[PDB]
Design a binder for this molecule. Structure first.
Ligand SMILES: Nc1ncnc2c1ncn2[C@@H]1O[C@H](COP(=O)(O)OP(=O)(O)O)[C@@H](O)[C@H]1O
Ligand SMILES: Nc1ncnc2c1ncn2[C@@H]1O[C@H](COP(=O)(O)OP(=O)(O)O)[C@@H](O)[C@H]1O
Ligand SMILES: [Mg+2]
Lengths: 642, 583
């Protein structure tokens, strides 16, 4: 409708926006604002949403005249795509339906899958020797194979493709899903597959918050029915979502009561009691999860490296200790949390992997729970039952917070900046106190060196602790008030965590620096003298020193304090000392578990032990171990071939 | 268009290049300069980028007349290829898009895969059993064998292949990637598949930075999948990258600043402090890494050998000593250094591998970090974790700087001129001083001799160094600048290594040769008798002194000195004597 008139209307609104483009020649696009066009010509901006097919084409040719007419006109009239980044309304992937088809929409979400840089032909010239050479059957990259039945010029059927005169363009297809931060309330990860064109290809990675704004197109992929079978959003402009929309927002009236709650006494005790009030006990585990929620400060050094600011927690224990429930109450309490299980229900269930799509068979990089939850939390239940592919990449995603996959024709790196509050189960049914943790845990020994807090939620029969948990469960089932309700409401506490992780950034103080120093040197020489003439036990490692500073800064952020008070660094010591008992202390002495084992004894005996009817007796009178211990030693040696 | 006019245009410009053609009679491809054609006719030269199919066809056909009509002509119309070794814009691999298909492009980069010689057909004359065998079809090397449905002469379908009259020509396919050293900031390992014709077959090997100038084709037609979405690149001329473009830039003002840093005092200690300022301690270890950065000179002796200048260093330490950190700060600081781990998911994470390609199932030789970083450094953490093929292949890459791989029909000999900065981890938990290193390290004993320096890092529970490293670690996290500001800027010190290795070439002096001959005989002959006869322990030795010559010349190159003075040799003793101290 009035295409020639729209060109004059677009040229009228077109000039400071085209003025800078007139200066920068290599810029192959033009970012146009809809609200700006709405102010100049509201009727013209209304035609953008109504008929986007005739509006984008007429605007491109119009601004071309606004380009050649003034000075600094480029020699070659490069394609000027009209990119309308802003729109009056912002839609949702769940809210998106068949009504917005062929309408200029602006849907927000997160990209989960993405294809390679697949070239596609724009002007499909078919080579017909008989006649009809330069004829073009304009095909879209998502559309199926186009082929004419007969040449209209000469009636010949010798049809073939002329890829020598064909002008090929770039094309990429991604999958836009609901954001797990706020749109997860619907509990439906709906997806709308979209396409990307020149200056849009390779503009966003999977697991990233983007605000795409394009035309909702359709494709008749199936011939079983005349109506469309699948809709594909033809993205006109892509843009990453702003910080305010992709993060939790707090009302100004709540900003006062959040600061008021920080000034309230025993704020640390109130938050601990407010985390999972149904489960009894585990106050050390509750405070450890609280320190993981109020994660430490994440700083970047000018040398290029970036200091870690997350505290991963692992909950190992026997079945029946409500270790899976603890991953539920925090799943809804945390601002950005993706509750999932260790089971590899998908190819990219835990870590992002590459899988061939069902549409064209091309490998697409699908994100995982450790990618969609970037800058948030990911509570992984049953962490001991994982696939071999996921077990190999979590070693890098937990420390470096990056997932570099370079297989299946997809090479890139993601940002796995997530706090993995996981919970694993022992492979022997119940955890034994006479064996180390990796001995009964399916996780690799190197993987345990990544978690800053590893609590042992063991089951121990005691008349005092069992009578309290028995009466507590009865109060929960009876509907008691103070047995289920938290001291701080979940709605306010969810904003309290987001307020601390965004505004309050504590810094180390001289008082806390002396406490962190005195604690680290105190653990040294704790058990090294014990295993002399061999591998001396290292009670604490510099890795754990960085974890101690993260927990000390975590307690200061939980109190909404801009500095690490000496009392805050002391609180992290108690939590570390409590975990010491669980592992690396109060068990096979210090250094227990460590990277693999204490070594104080096991490793020590390994070097002494290092047609075999003579070697079994030789180990007998040697006195290195009893006949039962030296028996089990060679079973593990035969496991590795020794 | 105007193909007849283009032939007259090319023949008009067609001078000195043809003068070279008469000199070398077997010249199947004559090289033509672009600036000579651009100055002759910019409109004619512009037609080469728009449609090179008709441009290169009319260019060779026009000079074919110049091959016959002028005197000294060839007896027949000898096939000549219009080779072009220059273009106005040199594009990049990541910058190359689908908008350059069917256009003459000039893209630079490195090669990682190279196939063998495949005698594919150029024009397959399909013989029909009944009649009509006269028909032909221009078979392409990148495309598979095509098959027409029926014959036009008699309409018969009894078609068969005729390998007698078919002209089979040489064909090779290679994979050209981005630069791993120059474009490390781009972080894009993208590649474009390319084919090599008769003149360019076996031209380069994987790990060779070349500057190809060809036409971006397209393989959109595929029998397996019609929406193949694949674009290939036919190359017209290949040429290795020049040092002006394939290395870091050093301006004359910058070269002055680098010379000014040499006039600055105590840079022999400031360089050690600047390398990885976040991690505390390791004065001798950090100085050893600096000693490896300014590697020794490489001189080809008249006897056929060459003095190795790649001073390999190994950092065997315990977990928690931040060894990996040291491999990170130096990787970005070094001019040519790519970070990689021991375990790798690719085909060749190391020197070389052999596996059939995914396109046609042909065996292609793959490349790794020890060849992509030739002329530089390669830092590999988890060096102890490596496959059986890795352990045997590196020994030739480290010591002899060569990669001899002839399996799977890929006859090739790569040159791995790399200075490796490795860091192994003993399998028996924490490293125990009581038992030796080879008992705790899976590395072969001869591999340890390849590393000139071996630092035994450790984390001792000494409250003295603990309180010092705890106060230092707190300073790094607190944001203190002193902990994260090097004595020499990272960008300035990166140019300091390139200017030192390229220009400064220290030569042996009497003062250094006497100290290197004194310190050798007071220690080698001192413990030569060894103990209890049998296999006597060998401290310093010929190979040790060799490495020791690298250590003395590295100190002179570190301070931008052409003469290795005795104190530069004395500084070499302080580092090598610590090696027997720590080990
Ligand atoms: N401290 C506790 N307070 C209340 N219930 C508990 C507590 N510890 C364990 N339980 C009980 O354990 C049962 C199973 O919990 P669950 O989360 O399935 O543990 P797991 O998954 O390890 O088996 C629940 O019915 C819960 O009531
Ligand atoms: N001299 C030092 N200065 C600062 N940090 C150190 C030092 N030595 C060890 N560290 C600690 O070691 C940790 C990194 O060690 P890492 O390289 O991961 O060892 P590994 O490779 O065996 O796992 C860092 O968190 C750092 O705090
Ligand atoms: Mg490491």
């Amino acid at each position: 409708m009035d295409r020639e008139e729209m060109i004059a209307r677009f040229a009228k609104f077109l000039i400071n926006r085209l003025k800078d483009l007139l200066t920068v020649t290599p810029k192959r696009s033009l970012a146009i604002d809809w609200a700006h066009l709405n102010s100049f010509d509201p009727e013209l901006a209304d035609e953008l949403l109504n008929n986007p097919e005739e509006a984008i084409a007429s605007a491109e040719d119009a601004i071309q005249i606004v380009l050649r007419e003034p000075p600094l006109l480029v020699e070659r009239e490069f394609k000027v795509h009209a990119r309308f980044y802003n729109l009056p309304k912002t839609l949702l992937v769940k809210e998106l339906g068949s009504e917005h088809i062929n309408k200029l929409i602006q849907v927000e979400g997160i990209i989960t899958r993405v294809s390679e840089v697949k070239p596609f032909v724009e002007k499909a010239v078919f080579v017909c020797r008989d006649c009809g050479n330069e004829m073009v059957r304009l095909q879209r990259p998502y559309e199926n194979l186009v082929k004419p039945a007969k040449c209209d010029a000469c009636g010949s059927r010798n049809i073939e493709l002329d890829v020598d005169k064909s002008r090929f363009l770039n094309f990429q297809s991604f999958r836009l899903q609901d954001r797990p931060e706020s749109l997860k309330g619907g509990q439906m990860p709906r997806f709308v597959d979209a396409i990307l064109l020149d200056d849009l290809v390779d503009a966003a990675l999977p697991g990233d918050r983007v605000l795409v704004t394009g035309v909702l197109r359709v494709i008749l992929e199936q011939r079983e029915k005349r109506p469309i079978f699948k809709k594909i959003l033809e993205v006109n402009h892509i843009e990453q979502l702003s910080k305010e929309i992709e993060e939790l927002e707090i009302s100004p009236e709540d900003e006062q009561k959040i600061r008021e709650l920080a000034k309230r006494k025993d704020i640390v005790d109130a938050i601990v009691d407010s985390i999972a009030p149904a489960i009894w006990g585990h106050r050390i585990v509750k405070k450890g999860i609280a320190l993981a929620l109020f994660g430490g400060v994440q700083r970047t050094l000018p040398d290029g490296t970036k200091l870690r600011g997350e505290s991963h927690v692992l909950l190992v224990g026997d079945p029946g200790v409500a270790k899976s429930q603890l991953l539920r109450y925090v799943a809804n309490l945390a601002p950005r949390a993706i509750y999932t299980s260790g089971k590899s229900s998908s190819a990219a269930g835990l870590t992002a992997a590459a899988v061939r799509d069902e549409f064209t068979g091309s490998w697409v990089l699908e994100a995982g729970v450790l990618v969609l939850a970037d800058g948030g939390f990911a509570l992984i239940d049953e962490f001991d039952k994982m696939s071999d592919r996921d077990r190999s990449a979590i070693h890098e995603a937990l420390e470096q917070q990056t997932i570099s996959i370079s297989k299946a024709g997809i090479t890139a790196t993601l940002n796995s900046r997530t706090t993995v509050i996981a919970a694993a189960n022992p492979k022997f049914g119940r955890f034994n106190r006479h064996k180390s943790l990796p001995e009964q845990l399916d996780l690799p020994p190197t993987l345990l060196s990544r978690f800053d807090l590893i609590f042992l939620l063991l089951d121990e029969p005691d008349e005092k602790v069992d009578a309290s948990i028995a009466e507590h469960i009865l109060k929960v089932r009876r509907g008691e008030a103070e047995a289920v309700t938290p001291k701080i409401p979940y709605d306010l506490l969810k904003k309290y965590i987001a307020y601390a992780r965004k505004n309050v950034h504590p810094v180390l103080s001289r008082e806390a620096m002396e406490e962190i120093k005195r604690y680290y040197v105190k653990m040294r020489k704790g058990l090294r003298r014990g295993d002399e003439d061999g591998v001396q036990p290292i009670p604490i490692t510099a890795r754990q020193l960085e974890a101690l500073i993260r927990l000390s800064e975590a307690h200061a952020r939980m109190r909404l304090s801009e500095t690490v008070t000496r009392e805050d660094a002391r609180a992290a010591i108690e939590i570390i000392e409590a975990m010491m008992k669980t592992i690396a202390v109060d068990e096979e002495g210090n250094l227990d578990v460590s990277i693999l084992e204490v070594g104080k004894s096991s490793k020590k005996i390994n070097k002494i032990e290092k047609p075999e009817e003579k070697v079994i007796e030789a180990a007998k009178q040697a006195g290195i171990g009893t006949k039962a211990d030296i028996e089990k030693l060679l079973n593990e040696l035969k496991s590795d071939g020794r």
